[PDB]
Design a protein around this ligand. Structure first.
Ligand SMILES: [K+]
Ligand SMILES: [K+]
Ligand SMILES: [K+]
Ligand SMILES: [K+]
Ligand SMILES: [Mg+2]
Ligand SMILES: [Mg+2]
Ligand SMILES: [Mg+2]
Ligand SMILES: [Mg+2]
Ligand SMILES: [Mg+2]
Ligand SMILES: [Mg+2]
Ligand SMILES: [Mg+2]
Ligand SMILES: [Mg+2]
Ligand SMILES: [Mg+2]
Ligand SMILES: [Mg+2]
Ligand SMILES: [Mg+2]
Ligand SMILES: [Mg+2]
Ligand SMILES: [Mg+2]
Ligand SMILES: [Mg+2]
Ligand SMILES: [Mg+2]
Ligand SMILES: [Mg+2]
Ligand SMILES: [Mg+2]
Ligand SMILES: [Mg+2]
Ligand SMILES: [Mg+2]
Ligand SMILES: [Mg+2]
Ligand SMILES: [Mg+2]
Ligand SMILES: [Mg+2]
Ligand SMILES: [Mg+2]
Lengths: 63, 183, 98, 62, 133, 138
RNA sequence: AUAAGCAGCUCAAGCAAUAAGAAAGCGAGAGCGUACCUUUUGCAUAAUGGGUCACCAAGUUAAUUUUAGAUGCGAGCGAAU
RNA sequence: GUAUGUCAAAAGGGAAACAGCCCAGAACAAGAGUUAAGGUUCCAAAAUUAUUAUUAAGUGAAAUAAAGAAAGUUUUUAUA
RNA sequence: CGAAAAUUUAACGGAUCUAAAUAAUAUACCGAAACCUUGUCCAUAUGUAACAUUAGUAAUAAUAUUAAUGUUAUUUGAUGGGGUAGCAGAACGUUGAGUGAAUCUUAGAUUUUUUUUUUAUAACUAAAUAUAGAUGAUAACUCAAGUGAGAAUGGU
């Protein structure tokens, strides 16, 4: 295109569908598991020490 | 800039999708009721969905300059669905620049020589950007007349179940449940 | 003629929708002005003339919203999108019978 | 004002004369009125100039 | 102050516990998705800031982690999170010349533009413990 | 009450008489809002440009400084800590931390007056050879 | 060396510094863009002129008559003794 | 000739390409900002979004070829 | 159906469409250098404060203020912004000249380049090459012009 601003609009990609359902009259937390490969810092529950209280049911099971 | 800092390997990989030109498509059909009247995707409505895959426009990382397209295996092209009287009244024209040398052929006569796969390649070709990537993208459309093709092992799978198979959706939901057992 | 002014003879369903909303928006400007004055017990001669001999978008026939009267036409009718500045000009009444 | 020294000066090229005509190519006589006869030829000159009158140096009492 | 939702009071600890967190701050209405350590280059010269000033951002539309996302209706409540930046000076662009000109008209008018930009550095992005609230 | 008139469309191709109606209302450019009393003289002025403006009855008039505050976005930041700054008109203004709250501006004709550490201040710190941190701190 | 660009502009992979530090340049690929001037109601026009580069090349001076601003003197001014 | 406007001397969006038409008057950048005309399956930014009918001719879908003919079809109004 | 023309499908822009056609409606979205928001540039104002220069007026042995000009900031959260013919204002650059018997230069003046920075038709930082003490260069202000060229089937 002629200008950089026009190129930005033609190459636009909307955000994920989950980020479009904005709440009203308050704040909320939604479960949004991304379709991506998790890193190695998300340790599985099997590799967590017994003492670690962070071990907990799946986030799905909290909703 | 964090959102795009990471491994982009699998975002640019070529996925081998599959679709049958005979299987009814509730989304790409104009007859949405009753259940028995749902037709397959028409020639141009199937081609418009394929041209979107060949361009990689279904991805959130799409860029017209980068060739982030995928493969599409279209089977059962002999039973390509068409409305009205297109099959016997639509004409394809060709010229070689020499006056007098205009070549015309009907859709049914073009399906007797090169099958229905050629009629689909012409539709998808005209729906792709006219640039230096048009022939690469159109080459990733592997259309066959019957159910046989050499890519039955390339089709994307999830848990051993080919996408579009009877039980592929349940195989996908079972793998994501185990993914949540981590910090 | 050889100069090409490619103006179609009919309007599209999109132009017709905005024409409906432009006629309906001028109805709100005349009603707001007429209601604001009525509270003060006042009237304007131009606002009383409009409400008298001009219809609202809900009282207009489909052929009066998208067409005008041209005597040089086969059936004395012409697309309203052929009028100069038709988008910013008021046109709702045509000769009787035509 | 230096005429004919670029467009951005404001007096470039035509140099205030416009495009063509007598007033760009050559010069128009000052007394010319296009052809119409002047008012001094249509009405004539009125009176004469006294060449024998004295030029007094007026002096007032104030 | 309006009390925080009970549904937000039970899942915020799960959101703050995950490894990484991101936020979408809003400076003068324009959003900027940032993380602790990012360098935001604002498209304007913030007036009244010198290299070394510490700001406190308070308009965040989204504070989320991998799986969990906290979305405020107009914005997220300032009590839940804490975000701060530091001004790293201002930067400039190379002078770009625009030539306004018409066909068959020798005059070429020039426009010289050289704008400045303030650079920030997100040095703190933490989610508060809301057990007391 | 008043009329809240906003110019929605332009008049680039309309007659010159339509430009004089928009000028009498005060509408110079697009999307400009002007407030006028509810009177026939102004009501009849809007019937000529009723295809270009948007009218709304409002109780009170909004000042110029109040029409612009409804489109002003929240800054989104608060300067909590400032550094030592020299102001040309006033003088040096020491660093302040608004989180623990003090804009003290010291002006003078000698270095000591500004409140900064001079060469003399650095020589008294170098002669304090007896100062030492407490053993517990160390 | 699969391609139909007034050769620029917008987005930009990649290559490019033996080495701590340091990337100008070239740019695949995507998009936008039909030279300039003159003359005309109107020119990408298949209307005018120019092979390229460097240099030479066009409102100036004189007398005369005026205006504006500034400034000296002032019912006097200027010139000259 | 008259009335009005644009171009001329006005770039930009739309009309496939476009001096004169529909919008809109370019000081310079940033923004999934807000809008006009115009549009939203793909080329190509945005609906394969909803409701009710008609057409089977690719008619048509952004430049209406006529009078006319006819067990083409639909609806309405009579009527057996 | 009527409906036939000569390079090629040949006025859906094309692919294609049984709606993605047509008619009567409804909503959302996209959409310009338009508008808004946040900054910047330029023009013209209105007050105030500060910095500098020049020229006055006072004070000072035990510095303040007045006026003009330049400049930055700030108040009204000031207003304004396409352009031919044409009119007007403000500046840069070039050649020579005065201050100049001045200023600077092997501790590198000057070097047609490259490079760097600065709102920038200009200058500046550095690098490289060479080697000048004046028949060298030069800030600032001012004076005078053989003073600014992609355009004349121009000239050499
Ligand atoms: K003149
Ligand atoms: K020639
Ligand atoms: K000359
Ligand atoms: K040099
Ligand atoms: Mg023609
Ligand atoms: Mg001019
Ligand atoms: Mg003159
Ligand atoms: Mg000429
Ligand atoms: Mg003339
Ligand atoms: Mg090649
Ligand atoms: Mg081209
Ligand atoms: Mg002619
Ligand atoms: Mg030519
Ligand atoms: Mg010369
Ligand atoms: Mg003058
Ligand atoms: Mg005009
Ligand atoms: Mg002309
Ligand atoms: Mg235009
Ligand atoms: Mg179109
Ligand atoms: Mg948007
Ligand atoms: Mg699209
Ligand atoms: Mg057709
Ligand atoms: Mg065609
Ligand atoms: Mg503007
Ligand atoms: Mg303007
Ligand atoms: Mg020449
Ligand atoms: Mg020659």
């Amino acid at each position: 295109q002629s200008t950089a601003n026009r190129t930005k609009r033609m190459l636009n990609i909307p955000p994920h569908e989950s980020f479009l359902n904005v709440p009203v009259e308050g704040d909320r937390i939604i479960f949004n598991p991304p379709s991506s490969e998790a890193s190695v810092y998300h340790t599985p529950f099997k590799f967590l020490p017994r003492s670690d209280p962070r071990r907990r049911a799946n986030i799905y099971k909290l909703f | 800039m964090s959102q795009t800092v990471g491994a982009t390997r699998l975002a640019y990989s070529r996925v081998w999708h599959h679709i049958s030109a005979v299987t009814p498509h509730p989304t790409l059909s104009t007859i949405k009721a009753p259940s028995e009247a749902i037709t397959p995707p028409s020639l141009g409505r199937l081609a418009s969905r394929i041209a979107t895959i060949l361009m990689g426009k279904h991805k959130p990382i799409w860029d017209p300059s980068t060739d982030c397209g995928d493969y599409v295996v279209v089977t059962n092209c002999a039973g390509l669905y068409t409305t009205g009287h297109k099959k016997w009244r639509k004409t394809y024209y060709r010229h070689n620049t020499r006056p007098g040398s205009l070549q015309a052929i009907t859709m049914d006569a073009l399906m007797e020589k090169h099958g229905g796969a050629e009629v689909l390649r012409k539709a998808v070709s005209g729906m792709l950007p006219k640039n230096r990537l048009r022939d690469k993208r159109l080459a990733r459309l592997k259309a066959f007349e019957g159910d046989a093709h050499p890519y039955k092992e390339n089709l994307v799978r999830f848990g051993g179940k080919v996408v579009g198979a009877p039980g592929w959706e349940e195989a996908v939901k079972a793998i994501r449940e185990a993914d949540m057992e981590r910090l | 003629g050889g100069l090409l002014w490619k103006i179609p003879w009919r309007m599209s369903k999109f132009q017709k929708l905005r024409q409906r909303r432009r006629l309906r928006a001028v109805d709100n400007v005349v009603a707001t002005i007429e209601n604001a004055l009525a509270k003060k017990g006042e009237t304007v001669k131009a606002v009383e003339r409009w409400r008298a001999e001009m219809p609202t978008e809900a009282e207009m026939l489909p052929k009066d919203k998208y067409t005008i009267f041209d005597r040089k036409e086969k059936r004395y009718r012409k697309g309203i999108h052929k009028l100069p500045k038709w988008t910013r000009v008021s046109q709702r009444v045509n000769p009787p019978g035509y | 004002i230096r005429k004919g020294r670029g467009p951005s000066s404001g007096y470039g090229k035509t140099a205030g004369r416009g495009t063509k005509g007598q007033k760009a190519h050559g010069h128009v006589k000052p007394w010319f009125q296009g052809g119409q006869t002047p008012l001094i030829v249509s009405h004539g000159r009125k009176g004469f100039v006294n060449q024998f009158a004295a030029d007094m140096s007026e002096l007032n009492l104030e | 102050q309006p009390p925080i939702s009970q549904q937000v009071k039970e899942l915020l600890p799960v959101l703050a516990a995950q490894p990484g967190h991101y936020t979408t701050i809003h400076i003068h209405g324009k959003p900027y998705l940032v993380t602790e350590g990012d360098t935001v280059k604002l498209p304007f010269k913030m007036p009244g800031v010198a290299p070394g000033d510490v700001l406190r951002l308070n308009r965040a539309s989204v504070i989320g982690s991998r799986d969990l996302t906290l979305q405020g209706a107009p914005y997220v409540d300032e009590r839940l999170f804490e975000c701060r930046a530091i001004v790293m000076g201002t930067e400039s662009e190379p002078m770009r010349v625009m030539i306004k000109k018409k066909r068959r008209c020798r005059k070429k008018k020039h426009v010289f533009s050289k704008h400045k930009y303030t650079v920030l550095r997100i040095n703190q992005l933490k989610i508060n413990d809301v057990s007391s609230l | 009450s008043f009329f809240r008139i906003t110019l929605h469309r332009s008049a680039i191709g309309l007659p010159k008489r339509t430009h004089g109606v928009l000028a009498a209302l005060g509408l110079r450019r697009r999307n400009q809002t002007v407030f006028h009393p509810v009177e026939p003289q102004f009501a009849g002025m809007l019937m000529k440009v009723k295809e270009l403006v948007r009218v709304e009855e409002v109780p009170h008039r909004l000042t110029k400084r109040e029409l612009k505050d409804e489109r002003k976005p929240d800054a989104g930041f608060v300067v909590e800590k400032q550094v030592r700054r020299f102001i040309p008109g006033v003088g040096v203004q020491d660093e302040v931390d608004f989180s623990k709250v003090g804009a003290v501006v010291r002006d003078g004709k000698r270095a000591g007056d500004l409140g900064v550490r001079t060469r003399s201040d650095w020589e008294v710190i170098g002669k304090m050879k007896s100062v030492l941190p407490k053993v517990k701190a160390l």
